[PDB]
Design a protein around this ligand. Structure first.
Ligand code: PC1
Ligand code: 3PE
Ligand code: 3PE
Ligand code: PLC
Ligand code: DGT
Ligand code: MG
Lengths: 116, 88, 320, 98, 115, 40
């Protein structure tokens, strides 16, 4: 049948959502010494808040194969921050400290330009 | 010495102590049989953070399969007692 | 000239006698997995020698005449009784595990000596490294207590750290449902009582804590029930191994001298197997221990040192 | 005696007290052990050279050769402590008797 | 009076150049200017260099060889002795016992670097 | 009526770190059976 599709790691959501939790634990117990080695100027508080935001955006997913990739890519993004392959700039590219706000209210977009 | 045997009453004071120092939980409604998600209004990841917090004060690994069942402070206390062999 | 520092000086160095085929092969498996049939052929087609799996009477096989001794001089541990009433209050469960580990530990010392004495390889069934599968299977089912596990672990760490792991580990896989059926047709009334949940722990231990840890030290060649039926494939696979990992790569004559002087003396292999930890299961009262030790010396050829026993027709005792 | 004999012996007492009062570091004590030898080397040489004790002129050299050799033994022990605890603090050496 | 005056000059001049080299130039240091060079990349870890045993043996081996040198330095004066038979025996004893030290380290794999 | 020989309770008195436990020595433990503390 066409609907049947080969899996990646998990055969259903219940098994797939286990890895999200195991991945989350790795990140939560890695920020404090990530902020230490990289000598960042962000507290462990808002560092952990950032990981909360990243997961929360991929919360509407319902496909076990899509979730596996988002975990596989999540594990890679962690191996770079533990083996310090990333430099100080790469870790600070999540926090967007150099892009001016882009307001969402209609008037602000109307005043500035033609975009929606 | 200075390491008395663990007790269920003793554990429940250690368990609740961590939950007190959690900015997302109101200490007034902490209770001891209050569910983390039914009434306290916590999301799934909040429970995971608590279980991780419970491990530092009780040094031992809680496998994720076990963490799926610990959803109230009493169950946390029962789980540790079921693991460290303290019955009283 | 008995081996010793003088013999090592005079030339009996280990590396001058071991060839490229001097290896110590271990063949593992589950109950009724047919490891014995497989094991007897790996030794046969590699010019090695075979060691039957350590039974409760293994020690009696290498001492005296070599025949099994009455059950009293074994702790009254009987394999049959384990299956009938595994939850017995007399503590026969763990006392069976404790005794079998000692026999396997003694067997391993005999194996290492043979490899280091003449150079010939050796094939062994479940060894001291895989013996813990049964112990932790028993604990989960409730056949032993937590304290029985602690006593076993202490004896293991202070005794297993002195030896070298196997060169090649030949693991045979047999799904538990198949294991049950093989148990039925062999007609063993005591064995047929083995609860299935018990045979699942042996599999969980074998592939959950044994293979992953031993794969980073030794050579692992996993097989299935159908594959293991043929011995030529196993032998040729075991003849085309790289041997790129293991403690045996950092071994020289000096460190093998320290090993051979230990395997040679058996009262040093067993020294910690009777550490003074007063467990209810393995402790023996003073009156019972003394009474049994008195009977043992009254057997043929056990009263004096081997070679000075007139009752077995020894001669020259007055000049030997 | 002489003013020099006072200050050279003053240097031996100071080094001894430093050797008998450990702070935290095994290495820092080994230096005090070598400081004592230096004062003994100076004291012996002053007296032997100042008294024209010719055949005794080789004694300071024998003192230095053996004292240096023992220091090499001491350094080896210090290194082996570092491979076992990740530092050279004396307080890590409390397994025996406690 | 002449050796001390010469020693002071060689170390006074060496010092005078260091003071005029940290003060004459114009300095402007910021955070990344003063960071250790590394290799252009952020450091991997925060633990000092692990101990290497091979480097300690060469120091010790140099020391003990250097100690047997001091016993041989007086050889030029030791050859003016009337009893040459004894001197030539001891001189070749010290040197021979210095070759056995080398032979022992050589054969015990002490002069190798392949861990 | 047999002769009395020591039991487990009598024997364990000699199985401690010190013969006379006190406040200061309560933390002690018997050494390893092989005189080898695990590496760490
Ligand atoms: C003379 C005694 C030896 C002092 C050696 C100090 C040295 O050379 O380095 C200067 C280093 C320089 O420090 P620095 O180079 O490490 O960083 C500071 C840089 N400046 C000086 C520009 C702020 O230390 C000193 O400043 C010591 C003070 C010496 C100043 C004497 C100048 C007048 C000499 C006559
Ligand atoms: C007669 C002729 C004169 C002879 C004089 C000989 C003595 C001269 C002084 C020699 C200087 C010796 C150096 C001091 C030794 C030392 O370092 O002591 C360390 C000791 C412990 O160090 P620490 O790890 O820091 O722990 C304490 C933390 N508060 O630190 C301490 O806890 C106490 C420090 C005391 C330092 C003063 C010691 C004076 C010596 C007393 C003996 C005098 C004889
Ligand atoms: C004249 C005496 C000999 C002087 C020359 C010594 C050369 C060094 C030889 C050597 O170091 O080889 C070791 C030697 C042979 O023993 P072997 O078993 O072959 O090697 C064991 C290595 N673990 O084993 C030895 O250690 C023998 C030499 C011991 C004495 C060395 C110091 C001189 C005394
Ligand atoms: C007894 C005893 O103290 O002898 C010292 C040991 C014995 O050596 P062994 O081989 O155990 O001799 C005992 C068994 N025999 C007699 C059957 C062989 O000699 C050595 O270590 C080396 C001696 C010095 C030469 C280098
Ligand atoms: N509790 C416990 N039982 C053991 C231990 N070693 C063997 N046994 C038991 C399990 C089995 O019921 C019995 C024999 O096991 P086997 O490995 O020899 O299986 P079997 O002989 O039936 O077939 P096979 O040898 O493979 O040809 O002995 C042990 O270390 N602990
Ligand atoms: Mg069998």
């Amino acid at each position: 049948a066409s609907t049947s599709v080969k899996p990646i790691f998990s055969r259903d959501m219940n098994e797939a959502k286990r890895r999200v939790r195991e991945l989350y634990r790795a990140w939560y117990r890695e920020v404090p010494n990530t902020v230490h080695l990289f000598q960042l100027d962000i507290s462990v508080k808002q560092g952990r808040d950032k990981v909360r935001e990243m997961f929360k955006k991929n919360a509407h997913i319902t496909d076990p194969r899509v979730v596996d990739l988002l975990v596989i890519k999540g594990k890679m993004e962690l191996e770079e921050t533990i083996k310090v392959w990333k430099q100080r700039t790469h870790v600070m590219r999540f926090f967007h400290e150099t892009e001016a706000p882009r307001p969402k209210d209609f008037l602000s977009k109307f005043y500035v330009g033609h975009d929606p | 010495s200075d390491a008395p045997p663990l007790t269920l009453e003793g554990i429940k004071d250690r368990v609740l102590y961590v939950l007190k120092l959690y900015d997302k939980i109101d200490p007034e409604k902490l209770s001891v049989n209050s569910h983390f998600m039914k009434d306290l209004g916590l999301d799934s990841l909040d429970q995971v953070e608590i279980i991780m917090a419970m491990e530092d004060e009780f040094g031992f690994e809680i496998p994720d399969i076990d963490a799926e069942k610990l959803m109230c402070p009493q169950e946390i206390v029962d789980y540790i007692a079921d693991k460290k062999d303290v019955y009283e | 000239l008995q081996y010793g520092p003088l013999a090592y000086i005079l030339g009996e160095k280990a590396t001058k006698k071991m060839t490229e085929k001097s290896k110590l092969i271990t063949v593992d498996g589950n109950i009724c997995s047919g490891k014995s049939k497989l094991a007897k052929e790996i030794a046969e087609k590699l010019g090695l020698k075979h060691f039957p799996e350590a039974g409760i009477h293994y020690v009696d096989s290498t001492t005296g005449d070599g025949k099994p001794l009455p059950v009293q001089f074994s702790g009254n541990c009987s394999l049959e009784k384990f299956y009938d009433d595994p939850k017995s209050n007399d503590g026969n469960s763990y006392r069976l595990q404790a005794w079998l580990y000692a026999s396997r530990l003694l067997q391993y010392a005999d194996a290492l000596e043979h490899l280091l004495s003449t150079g010939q390889g050796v094939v062994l069934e479940r060894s001291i490294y895989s013996d813990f599968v049964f112990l932790e299977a028993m604990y989960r089912q409730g056949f032993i207590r937590k304290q029985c596990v602690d006593h076993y672990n202490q004896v293991k760490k202070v005794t297993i750290c002195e030896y070298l792991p196997p060169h090649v580990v030949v693991y045979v896989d047999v799904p538990v449902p198949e294991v049950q059926s093989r148990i039925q047709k062999k007609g063993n009334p005591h064995e047929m009582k083995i609860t299935s949940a018990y045979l699942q722990d042996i599999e969980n231990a074998y592939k959950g804590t044994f293979l992953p840890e031993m794969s980073e030290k030794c050579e692992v060649l996993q097989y299935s029930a159908w594959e293991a039926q043929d011995a030529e494939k196993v032998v040729e696979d075991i003849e085309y191994l790289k041997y790129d990992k293991g403690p045996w790569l950092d071994q020289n004559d000096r460190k093998l001298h320290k090993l051979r002087m230990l395997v040679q003396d058996k009262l040093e292999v067993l020294n910690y197997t009777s550490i003074p930890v007063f467990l209810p299961e393995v402790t023996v009262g003073a009156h019972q221990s003394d009474q049994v030790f008195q009977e043992f010396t009254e057997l043929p050829g056990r009263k004096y040192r081997a070679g000075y026993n007139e009752d077995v027709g020894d001669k020259w005792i007055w000049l030997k | 005696m002489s003013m020099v004999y006072m200050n050279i012996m003053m240097a031996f007492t100071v080094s001894l007290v430093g050797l008998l009062m450990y702070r935290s570091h095994l290495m820092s004590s080994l230096l005090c052990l070598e400081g004592m030898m230096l004062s003994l080397f100076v004291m012996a040489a002053l007296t032997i050279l100042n008294s024209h004790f010719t055949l005794a002129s080789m004694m300071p050299i024998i003192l230095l050769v053996f004292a240096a050799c023992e220091a090499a033994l001491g350094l080896s022990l210090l290194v082996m402590v570092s491979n076992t605890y990740g530092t050279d603090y004396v307080q890590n050496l409390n397994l025996l008797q406690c | 009076m002449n050796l001390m005056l010469a020693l002071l000059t060689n170390f006074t001049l060496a010092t005078l150049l260091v003071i005029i080299a940290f003060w004459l130039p114009q300095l402007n240091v910021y955070s990344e200017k003063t960071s250790p060079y590394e290799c252009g990349f952020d450091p991997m870890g925060s633990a000092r260099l692990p101990f290497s045993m091979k480097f300690f043996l060469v120091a010790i081996t140099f020391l003990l060889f250097d100690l047997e040198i001091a016993l041989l330095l007086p050889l030029p004066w030791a050859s003016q002795t009337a009893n040459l038979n004894t001197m030539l025996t001891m001189a070749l004893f010290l040197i021979i016992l210095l070759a056995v030290s080398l032979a022992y380290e050589w054969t015990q794999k002490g002069l190798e670097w392949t861990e | 009526a047999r002769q009395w020989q020591p039991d487990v309770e009598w024997a364990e008195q000699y199985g401690g770190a010190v013969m006379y436990p006190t406040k200061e020595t309560a933390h002690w433990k018997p050494p390893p059976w092989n005189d080898v503390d695990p590496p760490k």
